[PDB]
Write a protein that binds this ligand. Structure first.
Ligand SMILES: Nc1ncnc2c1ncn2[C@@H]1O[C@H](CSCC[C@H](N)C(=O)O)[C@@H](O)[C@H]1O
Length: 213
């Protein structure tokens, strides 16, 4: 399955996606309105639905091909809507209790990331939460080599098909990651009153900002 390959490619998948679901559930009500930016096949959205059966999910992505898989995943779910939109396009009108994203925002230029965080806060209710599960750069080129070693170590320990890891490395060449503490400070710059790294496995981290808390 697609879901098994993602666990193979992503170190501490269960910790990082689990941490995103847990922090949302401890920050918003059961009936929360949640925006999922770069939802893809809707993997984080599925994890949220499992925890929050009464939550309204809006799944957003630039790729109709990716959303086709999200449509199938959520075939019979009447509290899930799907919007075709770029992160750089106007966000859907607030208010949202939570805006979430997994492995998407790293594709934007740094200035576009900072602008996006500001635009996200504007569509969040007071006390609202932004959560990102993100590929993060090491703070030095030497530590980046160690980050890469640990990613490789997980992929080989997971018995990952060679051709799928090759495709994975190729996709990462088109990412523009930065270190977690830099993008956490960008949340503070954007006007989020608290921001924190909840969980981290070297190259992959779950962080959140709160709009008043
Ligand atoms: N500028 C942009 N605007 C919207 N979606 C974007 C984007 N750049 C990349 N994406 C989307 O971001 C996704 C990255 S793959 C991650 C998919 C899913 N969130 C998961 O965790 O499994 C892809 O679906 C890609 O189409």
């Amino acid at each position: 399955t697609y879901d098994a390959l993602r666990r193979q490619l992503i170190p501490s998948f269960d910790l990082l996606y689990g941490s995103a679901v847990s922090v949302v559930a401890m920050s918003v009500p059961a009936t929360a309105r949640i925006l999922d930016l770069g939802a893809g096949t809707g993997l984080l959205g599925a994890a949220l639905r499992e925890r929050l059966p009464d939550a309204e999910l809006l799944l957003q992505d630039r790729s109709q091909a990716m959303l086709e898989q999200a449509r199938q995943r959520f075939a019979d779910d009447d509290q899930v809507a799907i919007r075709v939109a770029d992160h750089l396009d106007e966000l859907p009108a607030g208010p949202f209790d939570a805006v979430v994203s997994a492995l998407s925002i790293a594709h934007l230029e740094h200035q576009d990331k900072q602008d996006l965080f500001t635009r996200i806060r504007k569509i969040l209710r007071p006390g609202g939460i932004f959560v990102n599960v993100e590929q993060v750069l090491a703070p030095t080129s030497e530590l980046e080599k160690m980050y890469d070693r640990q990613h490789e170590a997980h992929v080989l320990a997971s018995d990952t098909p060679a051709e799928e890891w090759a495709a994975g490395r190729e996709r990462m060449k088109h990412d523009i990651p930065i270190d977690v503490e830099t993008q956490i400070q960008w949340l503070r710059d954007a006007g989020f009153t608290t921001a924190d790294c909840l969980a981290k496995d070297w190259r992959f981290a779950t962080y959140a900002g709160w709009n008043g808390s």
